[PDB]
Design a protein around this nucleic acid. Structure first.
Ligand code: CA
Ligand code: CA
Ligand code: ZN
Ligand code: ZN
Lengths: 345, 547, 548, 344
DNA sequence: TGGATCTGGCCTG
DNA sequence: CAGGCCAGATCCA
DNA sequence: TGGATCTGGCCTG
DNA sequence: CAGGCCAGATCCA
DNA sequence: GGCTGTATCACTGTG
DNA sequence: CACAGTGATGCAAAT
DNA sequence: CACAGTGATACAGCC
DNA sequence: ATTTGCATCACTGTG
């Protein structure tokens, strides 16, 4: 729980709330910049390197067969295990939602340089509507791998959308979707245990189950302290999904999850109410069929973090969490965002 | 007498605030005993008539994704953008009209003017043919606007305004089309009707797109529909044509997909590179559009041919973004003049030092040339050095007396002659794209514009060899290539400039501090309302009571 | 039918320009029929009465070194300065009124106010006794004014304004003098009458003195004379007392022959070093004057005791220049507020990071303290960060709410209580040198000012040794040492401040942009004339006729 | 006739038109700064030094017995010959004329350190009225040295001054004043050959004669092309002064004098008309009882000098002149003036 | 090793 | 954000 | 010795 | 005066 | 009942 | 060829 | 305690 | 013998 200051070079005006950090064999990268890609880095991905508390963003080129994907502002992050990386949905800089699926991998690597491979796929069947703030995970049941998707936030349908409330958003349906990455097919599933919409939640994966906990429901403007376990099996026939409500959950939205130890996760950040801001950390003790959430010591927060409104961040992968605090300079620019790093054992 | 409409017209066009008008009315009543000026409540009651959201109108077919209400006025520019803490923060204040309601109110403001224009053309008065209205939309960012104190978001110190003008209104009579309504001063502040006042930065793309998306949606919905309006006791139908010419180069490039403002690709109308533009400079064709930009962005995103970054950029011709506003491929005359005159300014500075003989020079020598040029201009034409160059400076600097004064600083008679002929060629070029009706104002200058173009290009290539191989500026490429095509496509270039938008920016600066309420949450609405009142022909004609 | 005087009053007070008024007149005439307003030529003819140079007057004894003509209006401010190429280059444009002409114009404007005051004071009406007039002169340099095009000198981008206002008028009756006139708003823009507008740098002493010398000459000429003016059918005499207070610290230092602002001798009223001010900070006395400064400059020039640089500076107490403008020693309330509030801002900045435990700090740490203070100040008091601090910021930061907000960031409680009590002491001390009359509305505060100042000094010297050990601001020195003495000497502090001069400075830009010819050779004449018309009091009561 | 540019340090805003350069044993100094003396240099005099065409205005301290003098704007400078420097008249920064004579000399010298001695001298008798732009020289007649003074420009008399024309100036009377330095006495003389006023002229001295030529008369707003020779003798009785008018003079005002060779001077700079500016240099050759003015080659002036309206300068002493050209920046601060050096 | 020489801090604007 | 004064860290013959 | 890394120039504002 | 792109001088493993 | 008048709200702007 | 001011001055037209 | 706005809103006053 | 209206002059201001 060590909080340490980190500085940024001449690219500090490129990080906004909602970015995504990807880890490839011990190297963490950056995605989701501000504005459309420039001539300095047409690809849009960056080399997120922190050495001696200094963050330098270097461009990373793409492969010849890669797709130059737009900078998404709030996608769903998954880490397929040949180590790939899957993102679905998000917001383009022109503020339209994308229903497209992207797969990222390292095409070829040499000394200190890497070329990525962005691949475009098309989903068929009960394809989810364009949305953002959702979560996607992968399960490994009976030797078959399949992705899972849950609801989020999306614009109003094309038949009930007006220009006065053009940017108004509504929570998606509680439906749970199974995505088959190798075949690009999706099947809808309605679960009676899920009745209200949920967005900006955190997801924890295991061998054959996904633990969704926390989040915000826009219909009632509440942050429920719920916890669902979604278990999926893959027989020869059609897949079967079951959701079980478990007690002892927490109430948080837009929290940050990291990979501390095997079968050990911790949740940092988030918001409890509109003006209330999450100061505590919850340790998730994974298990075979048991879940235990415990609260550890609060990290030594600084005055700037304690007296702010928002922070945003992602997971570095190596037990490190990178969060930033907005500043009041703006007109002076430069120090438009104050960034921090956090270590979990 | 002095009916409330006339009193409101006086108060608006004399730049009198509500408090000052109240003082004048109170003292006039107290002295004269009578009630010459109408009270403020009567003024507001007469005000509600001209504001959008008072007249009944019907669309057929109904607009897609647009409400059918006819009583909507000032609405939040965020358009229901949720300011929840869990998502992207918003730090903008924006107030806007529904664009169809604004069009209806603007059309009914000039109701009697359209009647008079249609009468003067020997047409009937009750004729209800489908009118064809062309609207020029102008958007321009601003800077150095002071943020106010008080509660609210951390609003930046920059402003972006959206406005439109009604230029020409035509009715289909018989087999041909007859011109009914004519704008006499297209570049005036009295015709640039404001639409949306957002207090944000044009460099920021997310907030700009979020705020201007509903307006573009309404425009797209209305581009394929007709409007029925009760005009002068007889229902009439309207169809609209939209022209996005009121933008500058930077805004055009950052909107419709193009990258930066200075790069390998220079023009926003053709796919020409800088090097071959400098090489040819005379022969070109307009190719870029909005659908073409969308297709190019789709190709860039999909990468169908499995190409690397360099050749992919070559294939897409610099388009690496998704366009979201349809911009007409024209030339902004004011900024073209500013850029051309600034470049001739630095050419004068560079010719002072005889650089054609001395290729290498120091920054101290460059500053010496700058100081000498500035001092001589101040001595002769009484000008002053300005950090950023403006239109008045451009107009004063581009005269034959300019080269006459500068030639006293350069010894070479050959350089004197070259600069003089360059000035003469530019002065012959200028009225073609600075006149509002070149076909009836300067046909002699219009006919030989191409020949002047080859002469100018040859002079730049030969006599100024030390600067114009391997590069040439955006505005010179535009002026020497695309002007005749634009002038035959449209009819004029200066009538579609941003002079009216700049004058509206000046009016906004005055109104934000002189006749608007001082609070962050309810000042954009007041400025928008007062500007709409000030740009009303019905109130304007009360100051022209000479007959 | 409206009179030309009423029409001019409307056109002037409602901030209407000639073109807008002309088009309003033409449209009103064309629509209503009968002519309600009056033509611009009628208004122009009706405005020459108010401008100086129209009313007859006679000085007795005749003023030295000035013409006796009584028909002079706007004259060149250069006063016939040599503009030849063989002389010192001139790059300034200035238009000015004659001082006596301006004063007689103001007196004839306030004629009816004086008569009403004499009627209300239970005295007679045709009394012609030696009226005594107290006039406050304020000067201020301006910046960020853009030079125009056109023929003329290389004018600078700075402006200097000289203005005067009339505060008190008294007449002697028997053994006492009555108090017949008072300005209800001494700090308003409607009382400071412009006198000389120039475009020169404030730091350019040569042209500053060249343009301001004739005004000082006229002031000294009329300081010891009698003015006989025809007033309401009976000739009356007038005496004049001149008090120059609307000068900020920089102007006082420059025109009084003192050093720069930093220096070691900090105060313009007492000859005490910065260290001695930080050691005592309470007990002092006013000792500087124009005659003393002149004598000290003479001593510096002559060097009669054969001393070196440091000994001569110690003897002359920093006077290394010859003063040319006589300024009464006082405190400018607006700049005092600004400086004290900025010092409080720095105190808060230091107290956020607990400098009393960390004597060594870095630029990054101080910048972070700046950022967090700005963020929390915005959050709580709805204040945006500003690089140069205004007076509204000072007023809104001189509250208990903002100190509570700052204490929400200080972990310790001792610092909380120290800041709370220090802020309370400052808020108790403030109303003495800010109220227009502090012997009537703040008697208890005036009486307790000395004890509060002593408490403030002790609290600083004890709890804030990291900021005020061996160094303290000259404005704190003034506020803690000289305020009661200035109150006793004058009667009020704040009524003599430069708030009215600042408001006139604000009006200057508006007049230059809207109600003046856009030429380099007429703009200042037009601005001066229009500002005089606006500040005239005969055109203001016509807008208040609804209360009659 | 070599022209080079000299750069400046951080004291560029301290040089104004009308400064004076002071020479002692091959070292040139500076006087006549801008504004009242500051704490960076209370004395007001500066070490005017040039190495590799760079200006560094170092301060120069004063002696204990010296008198601190205001920065004069247009004084009368002379180099008395035990080497001292005479200055009389000028304009204070507050724009008042001074009728006092200051005598400057090197009190003591250290390694690259000079301490001056300014002495106040009082004049009795026919003391000249305060003025500026005039000239002062010294003559040596049969073992006696006496200073000569000529008229200049001065404010209107106290009985005819009006605040409307407060800053108006009138040429002084042509009375020649003989001031004796060691006694502090002055005797005025009226010369019939001198009828009009004269100011901003150049003075050339010799054993017992002074050659005044050029100058501007404000009474007629003309610049006469005159050349007067003034001879002074010192018998046992009262001194006798004779003025003779000589032909071949030039018409120039506010010109710069420097000595190239013994019995040899050159006129550089000045004005011909109100808007006409002196592009030519007149080489004057001296003699026992003869004068001869000749025109030398025109130095290669730069465009900035040729297209300017004003220059100002003084004499270095070692055949060098330090002239400056005003710049058009002003608002951009720093480079408010452009300076040049000329080698004779 | 003791004055020059930048250099940051502080005061008013 | 400039301008001026002063205490402090280098520094060089 | 062949790409990284600043860096000045130039285009629009 | 601020941002963005490009040709050019260092430069380092 | 209807027209007219005036207080109130959180701010500005020259500093 | 941006267009609406900016105000003092002067001469022609109206009562 | 600088002071004159700045415009919409709502309630009091008077015929 | 007045009073009133309109052109003229070199400029500004948003760029
Ligand atoms: Ca613009
Ligand atoms: Ca000021
Ligand atoms: Zn092109
Ligand atoms: Zn004091």
């Amino acid at each position: 729980m060590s909080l340490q200051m980190v500085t940024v070079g001449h690219n500090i005006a490129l990080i906004q709330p909602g970015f995504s950090l990807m880890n490839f064999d011990g190297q963490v990268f950056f995605f989701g910049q501000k504005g459309w890609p420039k001539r300095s880095c047409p690809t849009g991905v960056f080399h997120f390197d922190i050495k001696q508390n200094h963050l330098k963003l270097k461009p990373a080129i793409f492969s010849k067969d890669s797709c130059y994907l737009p900078p998404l502002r709030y996608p769903a992050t998954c880490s397929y295990k040949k180590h790939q990386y899957i993102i679905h949905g998000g917001k383009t800089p022109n503020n339209e939602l994308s229903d497209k699926i992207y797969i990222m991998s390292v095409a070829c690597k040499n000394n200190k340089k890497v070329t990525f491979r962005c691949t475009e796929k098309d989903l068929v069947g009960d394809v989810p509507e364009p949305r953002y703030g959702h979560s996607i995970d992968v399960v490994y049941s009976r030797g078959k791998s399949m992705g899972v998707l849950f609801g989020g936030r999306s614009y109003m349908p094309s038949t009930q959308r007006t220009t006065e409330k053009w940017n108004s958003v509504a929570d998606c349906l509680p439906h749970v979707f199974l995505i088959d990455f190798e075949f690009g097919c999706a099947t809808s599933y309605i679960l009676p245990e899920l009745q209200d919409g949920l967005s900006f939640h955190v997801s924890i994966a295991r061998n054959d189950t996904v633990y969704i906990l926390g989040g915000h429901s826009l219909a009632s403007n509440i942050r429920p302290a719920n916890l669902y376990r979604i278990r999926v099996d893959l027989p020869l026939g059609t897949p079967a999904v079951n959701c079980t409500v478990l007690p002892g959950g927490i109430s948080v939205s837009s929290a940050i999850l990291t990979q501390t130890n095997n079968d050990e996760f911790v949740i940092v950040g988030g918001y409890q109410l509109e003006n209330q801001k999450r100061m505590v950390c919850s340790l998730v003790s994974l298990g075979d069929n048991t879940i235990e959430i415990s609260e550890m010591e609060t990290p030594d927060w600084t005055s700037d973090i304690k007296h702010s409104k928002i922070w945003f961040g992602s997971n570095m992968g190596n037990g490190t969490i990178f969060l930033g605090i907005p500043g009041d300079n703006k007109q002076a620019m430069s120090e438009a965002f104050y960034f921090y790093t956090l270590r979990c054992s | 007498g002095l009916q409330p409409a006339v009193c409101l017209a006086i108060r608006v066009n004399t730049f009198l605030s509500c408090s000052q008008y109240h003082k004048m009315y109170r003292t006039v009543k107290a002295i004269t005993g009578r009630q010459i000026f109408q009270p403020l409540h009567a003024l507001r009651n007469a005000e509600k008539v001209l504001l959008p959201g008072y007249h009944p109108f019907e669309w057929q077919p109904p607009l897609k994704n647009v409400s059918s209400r006819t009583d909507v006025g000032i609405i939040d520019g965020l358009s229901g953008l949720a300011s929840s803490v869990d998502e992207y923060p918003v730090d903008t204040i924006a107030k806007r009209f529904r664009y169809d309601s604004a069009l209806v109110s603007a059309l009914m403001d000039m109701e009697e003017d359209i009647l008079e224009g249609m009468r003067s053309q020997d047409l009937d008065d009750y004729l209800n043919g489908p009118f064809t209205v062309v609207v020029k939309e102008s958007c321009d960012g601003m800077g150095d606007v002071s943020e106010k104190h008080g509660s609210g978001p951390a609003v930046p110190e920059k402003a972006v305004r959206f406005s439109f003008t009604v230029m020409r209104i035509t009715i289909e009579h018989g087999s041909q089309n007859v011109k009914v309504f004519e704008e006499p001063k297209p570049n005036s502040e009295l015709c640039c009707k404001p639409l949306c006042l957002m207090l944000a930065d044009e460099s920021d793309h997310e907030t700009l797109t979020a705020i201007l998306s509903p307006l573009i949606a309404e425009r797209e919905a209305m581009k394929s529909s007709e409007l029925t309006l009760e005009m002068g006791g007889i229902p009439r139908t309207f169809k609209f044509i939209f022209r996005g010419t009121g933008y500058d180069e930077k805004l055009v490039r950052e909107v419709e997909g193009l990258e930066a403002s200075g790069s390998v690709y220079i023009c926003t109308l053709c796919d020409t590179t800088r090097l071959e533009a400098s090489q040819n400079l005379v022969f070109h064709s307009i190719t870029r559009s909005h659908a073409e930009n969308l297709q190019r962005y789709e190709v860039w995103r999909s990468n169908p041919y499995h190409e690397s970054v360099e050749e992919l950029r070559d294939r897409v011709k610099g388009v690496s973004a998704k366009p979201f506003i349809e911009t007409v491929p024209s030339i902004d005359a004011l900024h073209c003049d500013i850029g051309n005159a600034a470049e001739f300014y630095k050419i004068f500075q560079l010719e002072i030092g005889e650089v054609y003989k001395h290729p290498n020079a120091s920054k101290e020598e460059r500053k010496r040339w700058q100081a000498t040029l500035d001092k001589h201009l101040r001595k002769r034409m009484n000008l002053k050095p300005i950090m950023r160059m403006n239109g008045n400076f451009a107009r004063k600097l581009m005269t034959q007396e300019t080269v006459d004064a500068v030639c006293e600083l350069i010894p070479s008679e050959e350089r004197h002659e070259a600069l003089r002929e360059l000035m003469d060629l530019y002065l012959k070029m200028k009225p073609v794209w600075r006149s509002s009706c070149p076909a009836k104002e300067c046909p002699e200058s219009l006919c030989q514009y191409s020949f002047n173009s080859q002469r100018f290009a040859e002079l730049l290539s030969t006599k100024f060899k030390y600067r114009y191989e391997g590069k040439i500026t955006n505005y010179f490429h535009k002026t020497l290539a695309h002007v005749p095509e634009i002038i035959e496509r449209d009819g004029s270039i200066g009538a579609w400039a941003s002079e009216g938008n700049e004058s509206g920016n000046k009016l906004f600066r005055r109104f934000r501090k002189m006749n608007a309420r001082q609070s962050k949450c309810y000042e954009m609405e007041d400025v928008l309302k007062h500007h709409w009142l000030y740009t009303s022909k019905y109130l304007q004609k009360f100051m022209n009571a000479h007959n």
